[PDB]
DNA sequence: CAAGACCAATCTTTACACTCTGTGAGTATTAAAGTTACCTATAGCGCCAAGTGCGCAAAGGATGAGCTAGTTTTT
């Protein structure tokens, strides 16, 4: 039972300090030098308490003298059994003097008693020391106390990608170590008098035959261990993921009645193994867990308090992480070692114990991939990820391709906690304006979210003495408490703004909050996709979609056309034509050149009347990309949709309009027009596909592209900075 | 806090004891030996002439770094790490 | 295959650490059967004489079976742990041990395995080499029964088969001094165009003294591809001169033995003149 | 260091797939430097050679250089590999070879490597051990430059030491007969306490006949714990009788030689006598 | 004058006690089989009793013969 391991000037660490171990304690990361690296520590300092010549360990650099390893341990345990008046036995005793005999010597007769026999914890610290001649110190000059310590809290590595199924050494070291019977007493000359009993036709044949074997075989004598492996093997019956299920099943049963708490660590427990062979790993491994406690009500023959053994894991798979978290709950941890600017390891903790039971059982896949990354994008709706996955649109930039988006709420942001491990996992929390100001039509006066005042509530840091450079930032908490009025003008019926714009609060609504990592975009992702400069490529990706998409109904096709277009006008009563002759279908069949003549005739002449009612109907050209960002289910300057202004009963003219433009003319777009639909994608795919025709050069299209999408591109542009920054930190 | 025996030590006027010659070989190592203006002044002299200061009260030591500056504290870490170094050596043998 | 076991023995690259071997002969020559050991009896034995609490040590091993559920013992296993349980301990020393082994429990069955051994002298003293084959031919001889050697612990049995290949005159001249008549020597050697002959080479000699003045000298003629056999010693000086042999580098690889009447006939080169030609030169 | 290297082999165990230490004494034994060998000039020169478009081979290995782009080739393993783009092709003969090398490439060159040999005739025919000792004294005496013996190819620099561990008598008996002044025999032996001793066996002989006839006999001698010289074949004959051995295992340690008194002078037993124990028999 | 720095081995190795069979808060708290373990070493000279001694040191014959003892270092 090990509390701190602190290393000082070794390999690749400067000053690390491991705490806080529990049970189920699992490592990982990108580093795994540094994982290398301790493992070699801990392997080194277990090799010099067992007095063993090894190779000493390097120093990090040459400008110290001095390398330290220190070890902690919780010995409180063995001091309640010896100290206790009835054990009465030759190892409590001797424990006694040799762990706290001196240190109990010194104290007088107040401290013993009443302040330290009731709740305290005991600590042994052991410090080794190694210099720069390669000479080895230990800070306690006494053999004894190193041998008790190591025979007491024993280490036990396991390495699965290299283990030979066929050596069962391991098993039969816990085994041996772990029972409490003295095989001392067990007489040879009864045992082989019991064989040769037991079989021959003539008495004493058996014990002539080993007699005459052992003249010819005389070796050395047994070893104590030796005698009790064969004891064993004699006794029972028979003799990679079943390997490491005995032994930790071995190692949790045989402890629960010894005073002795081994310390395991295992190497990639998942190598070559299906995921479900993991989970069924880890589910037994808990079940085992949970069988022998007794807490509470659960008691009964079979039920122990005794403590458990502590097991360090090293896994790169997110299944085993998932089952870890989901199974055993607060009696886990998760490390994370990654690097420094100057290059060092580190090692901090992971949030991964939850309140909310519901995110307990929904756990899954990507909450565990979170932990595999080193640049997370959180987003609330499902739009933005099919914006930011976008493989065409992530092809030009090699580096948010190494960033993971995920769809988060409130309370799941709440119960993740991102800014525990904010070092070792940077993020990012994209939101909306609309979240934290509020727009009314009917009262001339916008209003404060609660989200908002919690925002002002953290920035505003009471307790505090003055510093040149945060008066700016009261200043803008009092400017945004004042702003709560903000008295306006909406034109055009409740639709536009005199002059706010919405950009200036925006932009200093993000300086303020770049802090707490957090970005509001000015509008939404529709917003963003569909601005004033990309109304050309709008058009272009509708008259395709009309080119490609709308084939005749009819099987015969010629005919159709040729009776609809007798039957209907093709200038006046071109719309009624359109409705009932071009259907949107999967598979598009190829016509006659006379056919697909007059196809292409008409589908100009629908193109040429809908972009001429398009620029008659309105005038500004505004109003146009209004109308577009909101029948794609979204809002603008207002923070209006449709159903909020239907509730609100304003604009009755605008919204006219765009009913009949959906159910006039734009009828075969509609399924294309409900969130969630696909026309992102399409879109994103048409456009980068038509600029790369355009301009052959990287930077050519990559600045094209900033030009139409300034919002999306900047946050890109911003993200990948931000990852560079960080680039070498985080990556092995 | 893991020892049971305490010593204290100081030392007398550690600031104006140092050796000017001491902070120019410390530094000489980190500063390329050129001249900085034709062949009268070199870049290590005239990096150095920003730190030094001829004491009118201690005109007998000469030049000295003056506490109250800037750079005092890094150049002294600097100089001193040589004997921080023989020090910890000669302790690590006495654990 | 069960009545006449063959074994292979190689000391180049023998690890001392694997005592498979020995366990496989001493399991297959056993006069014993195990089946009536039984299993609760010992267990409950051990149990009576280690836990002073009634039901301690079963209680133990039937909580460590559970969790370790493997493939039941074979019936080799079992009496490969007994025999461990039943006795007190786990190069040369192995080969030696080996053999030993072999010879002791040969005595009482019918079964009779044959036995290679290949390089028995690797890294080996010359007094080594000598002391394993005086050591094999006394265990050899203790058991030998013969008209008046006769009573217990001496048998009429036939012995297993043994083979070596050596490279070490000291090994051949042992094995020729102290078996005598129970050992052969083979010569390989080779065919014009390409093929492996075997022929005997005489080793058995009537005459007492040839075979107590047996030395070194006399054991380097059976390595020798060209013999040349002289009588005084002017000879042995002329045709060893250093000078003149270096100027015919055809001539060095001949040996040159001094020989008389009684020597040539107790040697024989006639018999295995096809492997080793030799010249004898008179006057 | 790098003017007396240690050069260490062992033929137990010995791989003959890797060359590394060949590659090592190559490298390390050569006076050119490689730097001055333009990568260019020769790419162009094999592209030119090997190519009917000029620049295609140039286009091959820059387009496979993109692609497995690593660490860049150090000193030492350009100049292995141009010592292999030179050269027609890469137990004893690697061991011959090595000596061979080590004598050829330290003739011009003022480093002198020390070498220890392990076990040299394990696994080896006797003639061939003899065979190895003599191809090495040729290629002594080939670049010896002593009196009359001058002329190109023959030089005067001093030979690396070389130390051998050998069990055989054969290697020993070469050493002795072929070298003679230029060699020394160590017997290491024991203390009584517990310690390692290191003593010198003469093996220097005045006299040519002795040397010449030079036997097995003669080096078995070396291998002795305790030597009993005699002046007759009777004591011989009496001292060999195996049944009077029989029933004094403590005498069969000893070995028994017949000396006569120059025998005894050139052999000089006094000189070694804390290692090898010895007792003169006369009348 | 007084002073941190006070040897190696002394045989090895291992191991819970209890009434309760899962649990223990002393004012100063190891032992017991197992296995070795081996041990060992002597002048001046001769004589008769043959090493446990006696006599004599003139032969010789039982107490006249009469006699000596290297260098250097610590010191």
New interface residues.
Partial sequence: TIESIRVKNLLSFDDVILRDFRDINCIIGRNNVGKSNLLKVIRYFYAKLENKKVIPLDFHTNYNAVGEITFTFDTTRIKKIVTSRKNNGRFHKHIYNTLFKSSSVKLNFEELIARKNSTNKSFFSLTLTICKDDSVMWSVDDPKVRSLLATLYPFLYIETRHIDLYDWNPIWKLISNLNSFNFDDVDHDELVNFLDEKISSRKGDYKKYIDRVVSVIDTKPYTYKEKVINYIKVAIKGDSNKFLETLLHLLITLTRTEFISPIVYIDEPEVGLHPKLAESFVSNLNKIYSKFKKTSELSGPGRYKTPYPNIFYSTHSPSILKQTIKLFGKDQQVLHFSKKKDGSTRVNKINSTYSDERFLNIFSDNEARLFFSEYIVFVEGATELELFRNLSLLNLYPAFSLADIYDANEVILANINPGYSKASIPFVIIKDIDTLIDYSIKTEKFSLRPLFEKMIKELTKEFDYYDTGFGRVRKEIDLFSDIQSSTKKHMDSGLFFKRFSLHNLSSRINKVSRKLNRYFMTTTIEGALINEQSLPYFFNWIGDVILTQMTINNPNPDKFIEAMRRRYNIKSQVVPLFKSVFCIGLNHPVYSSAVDKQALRIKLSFLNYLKRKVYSDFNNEKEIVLALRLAFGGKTETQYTLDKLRKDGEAELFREKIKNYKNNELFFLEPQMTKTSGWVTTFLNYTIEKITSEESDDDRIRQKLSFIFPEIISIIEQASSSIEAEESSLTG | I?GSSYCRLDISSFFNNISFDDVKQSLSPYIKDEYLIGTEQKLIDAILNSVGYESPIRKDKGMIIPMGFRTSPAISNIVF?KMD?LI??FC??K?
Wanted: glycine content about 12%; aromatic content about 12%; cysteine-free.
């Fill in positions: 893991y790490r170094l910890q050596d690590a043998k654990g």
